[PDB]
Symmetry: D2
Subunit: 327 residues, 4 copies
């Protein structure tokens, strides 16, 4: 053998993965998460799970054919969740696709069925993992995943408002001519139409914007038609109209979150977490609030004093969420 | 926010909206966007401009990337049907290309591609006179020749993705079998892209050890280990991927990002890309095949002359005849 | 020749540098800037200038011997400023070393002599460069460099408070258990003992700390002995006691600034810039204020409303600076 | 700030102050700190612990790095005289070493180094039972043998920086002369570090072309081009640097960072590092020389057997005798 003539083996093969990530569901979103994670040198091994076996092998082989150009050494796939064994993080992009004419409670209840059939095996093979839930509606889905999972709140996280908060701060910095790292601003609460922009806390280069324009973000805003929160929500809705998914953007957001957990950065992300007993919520439910993400999941949450407008939107969101969740 | 900027920011210099490291991608199907996401995640471009004919798809993709722009370092994403949006690109990446229909002639497909390229390549060159053109569509070898001929650009500046992806996978699998990082492996696949590419087993070495010195039957049929399988496995995987999925989007996007790197950063790394080989490797007509090229900021600055063994020279020179026979049927 | 047999040249050698950086003065600080810049893939070519010719060649050759491990392709040096030709950025670390027993005005005036002899050649060979002044005292030295240089204010920048502001925000995030990217806070004004921490604007995860503790940073602070501004100033003074220079840290800070200019990031840094007609200053002088740094130097400055304590310290600093500068 | 944290942060999980990717550097002179700054700027370590005997220098350097910690990703910088601060390191990097005085014996210098290593290596191993030890001090080949013998650790886990830096410069200059990126060049310098290292001209190739095939007199004295100069130029530069400056700090720090990379990331890249060669390359006693090793998270997992030409086998085997003759004079 060429190998026997070229290499003298001194130690047994250590083939264990140290930073293994599994992606569940390999449509546009899961695949965007995949290429994003591969390209940012985050995993030793990427495992893909889906029911569409043919397409699944196709994606895995497409990624493998380019292996020299990313640092992950092992890509695997399969319909059987045993390939997910011993993951640090399992990203759930699978989930029901709302058929037009379907009620909201029906869409959620189909997802209970899906999650009931995938979440317990995820936990079986990967008992110390974190679960990152990315499918819509992310907040009530993360609640469903967490309930089925049996795991502490700290290790079941929904992607939530991280993407929209990022786009928000970005546009603020664009309009001001300043890099995004100079801008603080959160969108919190229920992902999507009902999300709450925290205009009271938005600040750039150490200056609370509301001291420059106390009307900023309100109906009295003299530039109200340029409202940046509305630009963020409309944009994603237009993208979904056009494409079907904000798939590149979500994959980018999920790569942001993974980097915080795997590298134990203790960066603050507005992600879906249990908010019972926080922010005036009294029942079990998941909403986005600013969380400190690190190697053990959510290690801390940030307590923010919402103005009365912000508290009102946030609590209305929780109310509608719980009225779905009760059924 | 307009009043916020006035109270917060005091200008010393007018905003220069000039991009010094612009890239345009023509075609926003699966291959184009895989190139986009790979380039963006690698901090290569000042600006990424996207061109396509379909309004929804074009706007959808541009906005999708924009919605997540906090997470990459490229700062401007632009798109348009008008090739004016591509002006002053460093590289223009052509992924536009006709798809071969059931029972469509190969010759007729290339001819449809001739018509496409006659429509876009002049505009590209008008708006970016100093760009390098990176041709990615299939069949890449003939298409890069067509793009160059239409471009009226210096030959060093029109480059096909060629065999860069297959050679990379070739080296990687050679590394896998030996249990060594692929940066320790040297190995080229050259020539025509796909089925008839030539693997240079004669020059394959790992850690400064030519593997022919350890097994002179390597890569032949009389090989007991059948290292020959590795070239076949490379060529087969690409057909398998297309059969199970539809296209090889992620891997071409990875390969294109690798090429953009060498050109923008002037790495002067060697890639087996599609360039004109007239007067090289014993060819005497204007045709494009993959040979190992030094790539930098001017495109192909140099080519590596490899002595091919007689099996390698014959496989290669046959592909040059294939390409020349296609070019003869071609018009324009 | 092996080369003639291996390579067919098709195009002439393009040997021009696109991102050339020159470092002036190759003591501990200049060399820390050098290894920091090399290691962050910022320059096509690094040029080193010093009067100690032997040590200079030694440093250049030490860097060259490791060339495979950084991305810069060309390292050059020489006592003659012609090697600095066509730099994007010239970092001046040279400058007088205060002999014990020397007055402050004497130290500054020796630097006028030094700068008079190096700055005009810098501008000769590199007419469109930016000049980053790093030697102490950085504020009045940047003023001196700017006057001699003839260049606009936008392209003569002192390193100023960037390092100390960074350490400041860092310690805030350390004490709170949160990554530094969650923390805004500036130190501005005169570098060193007299610098002004802007406690009124310090905020973490979108929360102005002064709303949680209105006494934070003052004499009434119940934890006043843990004052983080004082920790930052004392630390650098202790390091200099021990080492002679905060050389690794300044080299890190200068690499931060270079990355903003070269990559046109429009990030906000508190650097030494002309503050005549800003922040209540009436004469020509350089102090640190938050500047937007990009490829053409300082493109913008950030206007902050200082509390009366902060305005008082800042204006006292300017007063003492101008009373030196007049001589 | 204590009251600020209570109002701003709500804990869900107790702070785990455990580092999963710790590195210790022993010695905070020029070589140690150049290793520190290189590792920190490359995002390699969770924590960097520094050990030295001199209180001022140790505290000064640790605080200098800490004052600028916003600008690197390592989050904890620790230091101490007590080797307890090094506990649970992945790698311990030994730069501590005696300096040869005017008229000091080489043998007596190694013997002073024996005494130093007998003082620190047991503590290191006690506090980090699973670490890999990376020996950097000179003379590295003999010192790595001493460290290993004292360590009582598996041989695969005690590694000298060896020829990694000189081979890297060898390849780089070969790339320079040819106008090609060095990642296209393969070329090893092996054996004893410094004056008597063996360059493997027999295996030097660029882009899958063995350069002996193009000029069989390459690297010999009868070479018209005198490529032989490149090994000499490499060996000479290191003496020149020391003569003009005092030490080769930046380049060793760069080389150490390269080695740390392969080990922490389990790259399985090949480096010419100092390891034990008993029963390899025709040696029969326990000694350390540089040979091409596969480095990963367990240290040396494999070695590349290169067929050396007779000039290469003789130069190499002579160095093994030199090292063995020094070890004979050695005690303990």
């Amino acid at each position: 053998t060429v190998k026997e003539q070229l290499i003298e083996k001194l130690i047994e093969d250590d083939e264990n993965s140290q930073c293994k990530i599994t992606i569940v569901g390999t449509g546009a979103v899961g695949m965007a998460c995949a290429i994003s994670i591969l390209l940012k040198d985050l995993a030793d091994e990427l495992a893909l799970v889906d029911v569409a076996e043919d397409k699944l092998k196709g994606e895995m082989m497409d990624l493998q054919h380019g292996s020299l150009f990313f640092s992950t050494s092992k890509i695997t796939s399969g319909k059987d969740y045993s390939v997910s064994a011993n993951s640090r993080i399992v990203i759930v992009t699978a989930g029901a696709r709302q058929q037009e004419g379907e009620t909201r409670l029906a869409l959620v209840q189909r997802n209970v069925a899906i999650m009931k059939s995938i979440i317990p095996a995820i936990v079986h093979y990967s008992p110390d993992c974190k679960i990152l839930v990315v499918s819509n509606p992310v907040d009530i889905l993360t609640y469903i995943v967490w309930k089925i999972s049996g795991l502490p709140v700290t290790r079941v996280i929904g992607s939530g408002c991280n993407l929209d908060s990022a786009r928000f701060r970005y546009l603020i910095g664009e309009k001001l001519g300043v890099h995004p790292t100079s801008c603080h601003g959160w969108i919190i609460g229920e992902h999507g139409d009902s999300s709450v922009p925290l205009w009271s806390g938005v600040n750039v280069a150490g200056v609370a914007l509301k001291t420059l324009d106390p009307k900023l973000g309100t109906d009295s805003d003299k530039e109200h038609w340029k409202n940046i929160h509305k630009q963020v929500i409309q944009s994603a809705y237009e993208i979904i109209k056009l494409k079907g998914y904000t798939s590149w953007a979500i994959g980018l957001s999920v790569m942001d979150l993974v980097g915080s957990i795997l590298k134990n950065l203790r960066r603050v992300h507005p992600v879906s977490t249990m908010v019972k007993g926080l922010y005036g919520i009294k029942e079990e439910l998941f909403l986005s609030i600013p969380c400190v993400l690190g190697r053990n999941g959510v290690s801390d949450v940030v307590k923010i004093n919402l103005n009365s407008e912000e508290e009102a939107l946030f609590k209305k969101s929780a109310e509608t969420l719980w009225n779905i969740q009760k059924d």
